[PDB]
Write a protein that binds this ligand. Structure first.
Ligand SMILES: COc1ccc(NC(=O)Nc2cccs2)cn1
Length: 165
C-alpha cells in the first residue's frame, strides 16, 4: 500500500513524490488528475499522468469530451486509470492563471468524497496558480475520505508540512 506518508489529519496524508511514480508503484484504486474542463492533459500533473499512459488517457478523454462536452470548473469525471490506477478521477480545480474563481476549490475537493481512498495532487496548485498552502487547507477541511497527497516539489513539500496548522 502507500508508504512513507506523513499523517496530517485522521484522513489526509502527504509525501514528497512524483505522483506518476507513486501511481506505478501502488496501483491505487483511484489516482486524481489535476484536469482542465476540456481534459487536455498538456502540462503539470495532467501532462505527466497522460505521458505515463503513452497518451491512452488523452485518447480516452477526447472520446469522453466528444460525447459529453466539457466538465465544469469544480467538477469531475471517472475514467480509466490505464497503467497507473484502476480509475482516474479527473478533477477540475479553478485555474487562477486563467482568472477562475478560487472559491470553486472546495467544490473541486468535494469530488474526492465519492471515493474511499485516493492518490492525489494538491488541486489548483503548481501551474494552476493557487497558493498550495491554501489548497492543502481546503483539502483537509473538505475531504473526509482517505487522501494520499503526492507533492512533486521538495521545497514546497517542506513548506507545506512546516506551515501546517
Ligand atoms: C507537477 O508537474 C509534474 C511534472 C512531472 C511529473 N512526473 C513525471 O514527469 N514523471 C516521469 C516519469 C518518467 C518520465 S517523466 C510530476 N509532476
Amino acid at each position: 500500500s502507500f508508504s512513507g506518508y506523513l499523517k496530517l489529519t485522521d484522513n489526509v496524508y502527504i509525501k514528497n513524490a512524483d505522483i506518476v511514480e507513486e501511481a506505478k508503484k501502488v496501483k491505487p484504486t483511484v489516482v486524481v488528475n489535476a484536469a482542465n474542463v476540456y481534459l487536455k492533459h498538456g502540462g503539470g500533473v495532467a501532462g505527466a499522468l497522460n505521458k505515463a499512459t503513452n497518451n491512452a488517457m488523452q485518447v480516452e478523454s477526447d472520446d469522453y469530451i466528444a460525447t459529453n462536452g466539457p466538465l465544469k470548473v469544480g467538477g469531475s469525471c471517472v475514467l480509466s486509470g490505464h497503467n497507473l490506477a484502476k480509475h482516474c478521477l479527473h478533477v477540475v480545480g479553478p485555474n487562477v492563471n486563467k482568472g477562475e474563481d478560487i472559491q470553486l476549490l472546495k467544490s473541486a475537493y468535494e469530488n474526492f468524497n465519492q471515493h474511499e481512498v485516493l492518490l492525489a495532487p494538491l488541486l489548483s496548485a503548481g501551474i494552476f496558480g493557487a497558493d498550495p498552502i491554501h489548497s492543502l487547507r481546503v483539502c483537509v477541511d473538505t475531504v473526509r475520505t482517505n487522501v494520499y497527497l503526492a507533492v512533486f516539489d521538495k521545497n514546497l513539500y517542506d513548506k507545506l508540512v512546516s506551515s501546517f496548522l
